[PDB]
Amino acid sequence: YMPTIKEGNSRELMGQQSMPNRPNYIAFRDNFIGLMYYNSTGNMGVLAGQ
Amino acid sequence: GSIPYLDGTFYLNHTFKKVAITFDSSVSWPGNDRLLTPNEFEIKRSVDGE
Amino acid sequence: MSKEIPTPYMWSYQPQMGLAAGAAQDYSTRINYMSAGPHMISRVNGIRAHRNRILLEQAAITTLTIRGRGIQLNDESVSSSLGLRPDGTFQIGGAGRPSFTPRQAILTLQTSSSEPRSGGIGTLQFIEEFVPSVYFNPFSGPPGHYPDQFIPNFDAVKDSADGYD
Numbered sequence: 469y470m471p472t473i474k475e476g477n478s479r480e481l482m483g484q485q486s487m488p489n490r491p492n493y494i495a496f497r498d499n500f501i502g503l504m505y506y507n508s509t510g511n512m513g514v515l516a517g518q
Numbered sequence: 519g520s521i522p523y524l525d526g527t528f529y530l531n532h533t534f535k536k537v538a539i540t541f542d543s544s545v546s547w548p549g550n551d552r553l554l555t556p557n558e559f560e561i562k563r564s565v566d567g568e
Numbered sequence: 569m570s571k572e573i574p575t576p577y578m579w580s581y582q583p584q585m586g587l588a589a590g591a592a593q594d595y596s597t598r599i600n601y602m603s604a605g606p607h608m609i610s611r612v613n614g615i616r617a618h619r620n621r622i623l624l625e626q627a628a629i630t631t632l633t634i635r636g637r638g639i640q641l642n643d644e645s646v647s648s649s650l651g652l653r654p655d656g657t658f659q660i661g662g663a664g665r666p667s668f669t670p671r672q673a674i675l676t677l678q679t680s681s682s683e684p685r686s687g688g689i690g691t692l693q694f695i696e697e698f699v700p701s702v703y704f705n706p707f708s709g710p711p712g713h714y715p716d717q718f719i720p721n722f723d724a725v726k727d728s729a730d731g732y733d
Contacts, residue, residue: 510566544583 539557573617573706578700586688588698592718620702627699634674645670683701 472480496503505511529545537559539547546557553559570577575598580589601612633640647667654660668674670719689697707714716722 485526510568542581542583 532562535564536560569721573614573620574703574706576620576623576700576702580720581691581694581698583691585694586690586694588689590722591701591718594700623700625701627701631696636668636674636677643668643670643674647702648652679681681705 469485574690578594579591
């Protein structure tokens with residue numbers, strides 16, 4: 469809650485209220501899904517006799 | 519104008535991408551892995567230049 | 569057409585199961601003589617008769633260094649080179665000369681399946697067995713005496729397979 473848009477310390481800004489920011493849990497996906505390319509003609513896993 | 523079906527002035531052959539031929543809906547015609555791609559007559563490849 | 573020189577029926581294969589699907593008269597190789605006189609028409613009829621004779625008959629009558637599997641392999645039983653074995657003292661490093669044991673390796677490599685199959689037919693045997701069949705007097709019997717193999721929607725045990733369930 470910003471009592472007044474003006475900057476600089478003053479009487480109005482004294483009454484401001486704050487709350488914590490929402491949490492995020494960014495991490496690697498389950499089973500590392502998506503790290504390896506699957507089912508794309510552009511990038512196809514190759515395994516063959518040399 | 520011109521009649522490419524009659525006169526022979528075909529000009530759209532550059533827009534073909536893939537041709538797949540299958541007999542009895544289970545057997546591909548060049549059925550001995552006689553192509554680099556498995557069972558398709560891949561005419562033109564997009565930017566996916568493996 | 570004519571109940572004596574009939575256009576032959578050609579089978580259709582189902583690759584997947586191995587059975588033969590329904591067949592049909594040949595409809596892609598007919599000769600259009602509708603613009604011919606009696607001479608050529610008799611000639612063409614004789615030709616089709618010759619073709620039918622060829623079909624009937626055909627059908628009725630005509631129904632060391634072992635190769636391994638395409639690359640031969642040599643075979644040695646006493647080729648054992650490294651006679652040492654690591655007892656409490658020795659310590660044998662990298663080794664190994666791949667040799668096919670005569671009885672064990674080769675026989676175990678060329679055993680057939682445990683129990684033979686009983687089911688459909690492969691492509692080559694289908695070609696050799698299911699020649700086009702010439703049906704002479706079509707459907708000349710009472711109901712139930714017709715060749716039901718021709719209808720693809722007909723099941724041998726349960727008659728007249730209802731499509732779409």
